[PDB]
Amino acid sequence: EMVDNLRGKSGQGYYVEMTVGSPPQTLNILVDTGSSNFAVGAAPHPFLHRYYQRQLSSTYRDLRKGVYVPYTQGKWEGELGTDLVSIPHGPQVTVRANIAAITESDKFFIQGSNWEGILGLAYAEIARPDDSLEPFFDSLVKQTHVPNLFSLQLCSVGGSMIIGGIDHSLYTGSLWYTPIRREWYYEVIIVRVEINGQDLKMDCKEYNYDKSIVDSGTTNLRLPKKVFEAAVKSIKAASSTEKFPDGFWLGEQLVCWQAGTTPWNIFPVISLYLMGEVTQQSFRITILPQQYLRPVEDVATSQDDCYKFAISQSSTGTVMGAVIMEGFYVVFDRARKRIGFAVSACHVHDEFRTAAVEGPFVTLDMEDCGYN
Ligand SMILES: CCn1ccc2c(N3CCCC3=O)cc(C(=O)N[C@@H](Cc3ccccc3)[C@H](O)CNCc3cccc(OC)c3)cc21
């Protein structure tokens, strides 16, 4: 009953329905594996269709402490409190959880997005103000019998968040696991990057400077500057049969083709190799251009299909965002400190190429690829 419990708009995150307070107030909450605070709009905002009204909840408790959270995109400030929370299309339980009531924000809420809050699914180590603010999923596991694991199938868009287990109907083929290196973000280690089979030929620590994370709340694949520059050079080379403005590669400009004529075949597949659970072993996930060229829906331009380049540069490490996760079934196996990847039931492919998760591969270079 948790299948298809996610909705969203392309480029604007995926959200699940939740209720907060007594009596229950229904809100749509963005699912974010890249942070650890549960926060909801709690005052009027031009982009909010509704918001949390603390005065109407008999179970609300004020913690008398403010909190400020700046993300890569957007920021908000609010008041900490606790209240009862449920997930209508998830496990049928009610938990008391920490909630940040957002009273002020900047470039956080999105015009027309349909969500009103955010559910940080990562570890307490990156919770604000500090790690004593227990994250939602931690409270869920401690207060119920839900297994310490969840999975995401991200596919107007939709998908599934399966709390407490793995749904086999949501993937095909084998599940490959990579270790969670450190429990703060969902940090992983990339050991190799290929563009159309060609190795970027870089010290593998560069791929993980200064960390690499799996983040459902970020749209793009974000790469460390040095890796980004090398990747763009190789994607340009592969696609050189057409020449695009430098602004396209910087994600500042759309590229458009007559409806139905997008030249998918001139763009390369990107393979990211992730550390396996065994010494010097890895597996790879392969991303097609249908993933990293993000469609931008706009009726004004609808004579064409137009796209934004959804790989961009980072000064804070690699972020495997929604563009990478889409078309894969991703298991956040907290209990066993590992992340699993499999090909999703809602996968990308044309008649020539298919996204894949495959292995094992072996590396002769014994260098640890973790940056720290
Ligand atoms: C879905 C909306 N959206 C669209 C683009 C886009 C985007 N960017 C910017 C450039 C390329 C790219 O993809 C970045 C973010 C982003 O910052 N996401 C947040 C959640 C969020 C969701 C919705 C709105 C605002 C924030 C996430 O916690 C970040 N994790 C690591 C992170 C970074 C910094 C602090 C931190 O604290 C926990 C966590 C959201 C984006």
* Residue that terminates a domain, selected from 131, 146, 161: 146
Virtual torsion, Cα 190, 193, 197, 202, nearest 10 deg = -130
On whether both 307 and 336 belong to a single domain, the answer is yes
Domain C-terminal end among 121, 146, 171: 146
Locate 158 and state its tokens. Answer: 């939709």
Whether 277 and 353 map to the same domain: the answer is yes
- The C-alpha atoms of residue 137 and residue 330 are separated, in whole angstroms, by 17
- The sign one gets for the Cα dihedral 131, 136, 138, 142 is positive
Structure tokens at 8: 């969203």
Q: Does residue 7 sit within a domain?
A: no
Q: Please indicate, yes or no, whether residues 152 and 35 belong to a single structural domain of this protein.
A: no
The Cα–Cα gap between 320 and 322 comes to: 7
Return the bridge partners of 354, or none. Answer: 349
CATH number, domain with residue 69 = 2.40.70.10
User: Has 106 been annotated as catalytic?
Assistant: no
- Per the listing, tokens 């609010």 go with 78
Cα(142)–Cα(163) distance, rounded to whole angstroms?
14
Domain presence at residue 6: no
Beta partners for residue 144, in sequence order: none
Ligand 1 center to residue 36 CA distance, Å? Answer: 12
Residue with tokens 């605070």: 37
Q: Are residues 305 and 349 in the same domain?
A: yes
The reply to whether ligand 1 has any atom less than 6 angstroms from the CB of 312 is yes
- For residue 129, which of 180, 67, 71, 60 has the smallest C-alpha distance? 67
DSSP 371: -
d(CA 230, CA 180): 26
Cβ within 8 Å of residue 173, ≥6 positions away: 342, 343, 357
Rounded to the nearest angstrom, the distance between the alpha carbon of 143 and the centre of ligand 1 is 29
Q: What is the DSSP string of 185-238?
A: TBEE-EEEEEETTEE----GGGGGSS-EEE-TT--SEEEEHHHHHHHHHHHHHH
Burial class of residue 372, CB neighbours in 10 A (0-12, 13-18, 19+): exposed
**Cis bond leading into 91, ω under 30°?**
no
**Range of the structural domain that residue 108 is part of:** 14-146
| Tokens encoding 241 | 């049969």
Strands 311-314 and 187-188, by their bridges, are unpaired
Please choose, from the candidates 191, 193, 188, 285, the residue with its C-alpha nearest in 3D space to the C-alpha of residue 235.
Answer: 193
Q: Which of 146, 176, 206 is the last residue of a domain?
A: 146
Do 280 and 270 share a domain, yes or no?
A: yes
Do 140 and 260 fall into the same domain? Answer: no
On whether both 160 and 210 belong to a single domain, the answer is: yes
Co-location of 108 and 159 in the same domain: no
Pick the residue whose CA is nearest to atom 31 on ligand 1.
Answer: 34
Quoted resolution (Å): 1.7
Atom of ligand 1 nearest to the CA of 316: 33
Number of residues assigned to the chain: 372
- Is 32 catalytic? The answer is yes
Closest CA to 29 of 13, 45, 18, 41: 18
Number of domains composing the chain: 2
**3-state SS assignment for residue 49:** coil
Same domain, 128 and 151: no
